[PDB]
From a paper:
Cyclin-dependent kinases (CDKs) are typically described as regulators of the cell cycle.
Diffraction-quality crystals were obtained without the need for optimization. A 1.85 Å resolution apo data set was collected together with a 2.0 Å resolution data set for the AMP-bound protein using an in-house X-ray beam. The relatively high sequence identity to several human CDKs allowed determination of the GlCDK structure by molecular replacement. Residues Glu51–Thr58, Ser147–Glu151 and Ile168–Ile178 of the apo structure and residues Glu51–Gly57, Ser147–Ser150 and Gly167–His175 of the AMP-bound protein were not observed in our structures. Although the overall structure is very similar to those of the human CDKs, the sequence deviations in key regions observed in this study indicates that it may be possible to selectively inhibit GlCDK.
Author numbering: 11 to 50, 59 to 146, 152 to 167, 179 to 308
Amino acid sequence: SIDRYRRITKLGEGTYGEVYKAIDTVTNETVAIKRIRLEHAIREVSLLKELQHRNIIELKSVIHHNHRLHLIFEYAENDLKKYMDKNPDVSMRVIKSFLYQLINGVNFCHSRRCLHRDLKPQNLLLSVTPVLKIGDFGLARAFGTLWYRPPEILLGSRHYSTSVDIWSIACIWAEMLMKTPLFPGDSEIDQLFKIFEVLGLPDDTTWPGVTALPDWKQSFPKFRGKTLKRVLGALLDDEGLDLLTAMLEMDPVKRISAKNALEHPYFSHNDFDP
């Protein structure tokens, strides 16, 4: 279609290629256009059109013309990083709303067997309390910071489960509360150290199979764990700390599902905007 889109304004370079905003002359609405640089698909990305949910940036159209690939998405002006920068005094209610909305979107996608794999504040767009909408679900798989990366990936597991995204959510949540990243590693190993420093060094009881992961080191320091309570326990009520702890299980198989997170008592109090 791509001649349906006018006033195409480059916004920058994103993960996969250049990113633009444009006017969809059919609806007169602003849309986002992402050029997807390839070379080493259309059916696969087109399946993402089914991910229609208020907390998910809608994939509106897949345009594959003259050997180039563009995705047309719902546009959101703002994003979480920009928002947190502009709103130092953001209320706990807003944070908890954003968190619920994030988990709700993720649960929706996970229920459709669609993983994100690269959640970060930069792909949490905010539209209109703003409505949080997750961008780029499915793109990491369809097309190939460590701060939000879970330990099983850092330790070289090739298996991405739904649990990956849950980890990232907890890291994002922690950052909303702390205003600094929970685990600001500067390398895969430094990232693991940052995680282990808080959560302790795993073993084959706490995380069965961990020592058989490709990048497990027998020589890792025997971190006991500062504990999440020590790190941000001042910022969160008890139920909130319980949920975060469940999302930051290092063994991905013990990590709380998005579905169970939404069912957690933390979200039973009507003190947030869904």
